[PDB]
Design a binder for this molecule. Structure first.
Ligand SMILES: Cc1ccc(NC(=O)[C@H](CC2CCCC2)n2ccc(C(F)(F)F)cc2=O)nc1
Ligand SMILES: OC[C@H]1O[C@H](O)[C@H](O)[C@@H](O)[C@@H]1O
Ligand code: NA
Length: 450
């Protein structure tokens, strides 16, 4: 209750939190470095060495012919596994849907276990809606880096976001799925398309706004896709029209590009992750890591005797116990500290009013940096598109999905303002996808099956 000492503690906390600050000049440097890696990823000469893969998706502008009817859309990679029945006409409407929690033994076991579980979920969905005998074209949203040979054929480059199933990396993902369906043998599907989640988001948003040519995810992980000129897509023969490119920007920094900005907290999260040294840019933004970064900031403040009387509870010293959703909930607190108190009390802590305020500042520090780093990536893509299109003023729509962008109380606002400062002569409209994956994957499958 000594207000002079409370102020001195908050001042020391501010000196430590200041490390998270990124000036406009730092963001421009990250943006330019991102653009240099994007150029590298698209070229035949430097693609293999590029950290940002810029993977061709085989999704094109003006696809021509499209089929109508019932489509099954799958989604693996986000939160849980989703199966959706989509009706495509003229339009595209989600008619039926089911989500399945993936057992930990299937995300880190064998690819056979994972794909067997996926096939079991498909069998369950078809029974709940009496359609197992019906052979529908299937579209698969698969949220991982894939080197495509075509819309329905592509190899998994590597798992990300903690996935580790053996026997998948280097294999045709559509083949892994088709093989698992065949081993079960209680239904038949024509797997016609595979798309990244950024791609499915862009397409579902494009359906509502034809100026949408960028898709971005800020959920468990962070990535973006955009419509590139075919002349710039050196990995695909042809120079007419546009093709969607999956940047896989989460791997920016994997070649040392973010070294000067990485803090001790980033090094610890990276070292304890399933993929050390990989997805470094994603680890600064994604919901799989955000809460954990705050947890490590709190432990440093506990160690400096600036928080919780210099004592950390068993829960606070537990990996993953400071959930990303707590970061959003802390920053939603009205000022009375009730929401912050609840989270901290549940974590086995006995927080003071000052402890609550410090935890809020730690959350703001990590989430603001996530918003700012993300903004440099999106600004790099948009600025590159304006330049490639020889546009004086580019008016574009960005379709977005993911829990961090959608649910965090201020990330969106901080992110938009920073993107806008970095994108002179661009008019950017941001739209949130409404059941993004399913509709997007079905529209792609409708074209793919002729
Ligand atoms: C194998 C293959 C190859 C190309 C494609 N391309 C499409 O489906 C494009 C993608 C869009 C074009 C620019 C942004 C993304 N698309 C998607 C939906 C709609 C609509 F909403 F009208 F139904 C119109 C449309 O043209 N799909 C499959
Ligand atoms: O789910 C968001 C993103 O997560 C990881 O970055 C994946 O590598 C990427 O494919 C996906 O788009
Ligand atoms: Na090309």
């Amino acid at each position: 209750e000594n207000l002079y000492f409370q102020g001195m503690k908050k001042e020391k906390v501010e000196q430590i939190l200041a490390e998270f600050q990124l000036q406009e000049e730092d963001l421009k440097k990250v943006m330019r470095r991102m653009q240099k890696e994007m150029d590298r990823g698209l070229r035949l000469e430097t693609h293999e060495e590029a950290s940002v893969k810029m993977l061709p998706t085989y999704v094109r502008s003006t696809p021509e012919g499209s089929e109508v009817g019932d489509f099954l859309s799958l989604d693996l990679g986000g939160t849980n596994f989703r199966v959706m029945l989509v009706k495509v006409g003229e339009w595209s409407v989600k008619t039926k849907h089911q989500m399945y929690s993936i057992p930990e033994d299937a995300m880190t076991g064998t690819a056979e276990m994972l794909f067997d579980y996926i096939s079991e979920c498909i069998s369950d969905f078809l029974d709940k809606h009496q359609m197992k005998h019906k052979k529908l074209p299937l579209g698969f949203t698969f949220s991982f880096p894939v080197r495509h040979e075509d819309i329905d054929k592509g190899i998994l480059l590597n798992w990300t976001k903690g996935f580790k199933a053996s026997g998948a990396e280097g294999n045709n993902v559509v083949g892994l799925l088709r093989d698992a369906i065949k081993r079960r043998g209680d239904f038949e599907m024509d797997v016609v398309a595979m798309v990244n989640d950024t791609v499915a988001t862009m397409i579902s948003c494009y359906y509502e706004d034809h100026q949408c040519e960028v898709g971005m995810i800020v959920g468990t992980g962070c990535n973006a896709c955009y419509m590139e000129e075919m002349q710039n897509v050196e990995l695909v023969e042809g120079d007419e029209g546009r093709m969607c490119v999956n940047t896989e920007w989460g791997a920016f920094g994997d070649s040392g590009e973010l070294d000067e900005f990485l803090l001790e907290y980033d090094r610890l999260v990276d070292e304890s992750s399933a993929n050390p040294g990989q997805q470094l840019y994603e680890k600064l933004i994604g919901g799989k890591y955000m809460g954990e970064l705050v947890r490590l900031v709190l432990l440093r403040l506990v160690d400096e005797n600036l928080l919780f009387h210099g004592e950390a509870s068993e829960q606070l010293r537990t990996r993953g116990a400071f959930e990303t959703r707590f970061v959003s909930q802390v920053e939603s607190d009205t000022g009375d500290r009730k929401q912050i108190y609840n989270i901290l009390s549940t974590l086995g802590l006995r927080p003071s009013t000052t402890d609550c305020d410090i935890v809020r500042r730690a959350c703001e520090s990590v989430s603001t940096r996530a918003a700012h780093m993300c903004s440099a990536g999106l600004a790099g893509v948009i600025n590159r598109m304006r330049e490639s299109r020889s546009e004086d003023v580019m008016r574009i729509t960005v379709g977005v999905d993911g829990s961090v962008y959608k649910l965090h109380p201020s990330f969106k606002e901080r992110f938009h303002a920073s993107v806008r400062r970095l994108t002179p002569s661009c008019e950017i409209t941001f739209i949130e996808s409404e059941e993004g994956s399913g509709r997007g994957a079905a529209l792609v499958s409708a074209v793919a099956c002729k």
